[PDB]
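Write out structure tokens for KICSTOR complex protein SZT2.
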Amino acid sequence: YHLTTFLRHFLAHHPDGPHFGRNHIYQGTLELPTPLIAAHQLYNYVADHASSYHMKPLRMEHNEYALVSAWHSSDDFDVSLLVCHCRHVL
């Protein structure tokens, strides 16, 4: 399941945030300048070495891959992060 589309739908339909839910969400985009290495090639290499980067290469008949991370933090919270890459810039 393309969870990126799920979260896009969710934030499109509730782009405000109710005033009672203790949870929070945030979306942003990063354009990494990658002239030395191709953006697709660099993304694929990082995905192949996600464990080295502590990410996780989950799938999504093409199966797109997203790098995810999670960790507890502090008021206690559970913090997570998922990244999907969407000619020398990533």
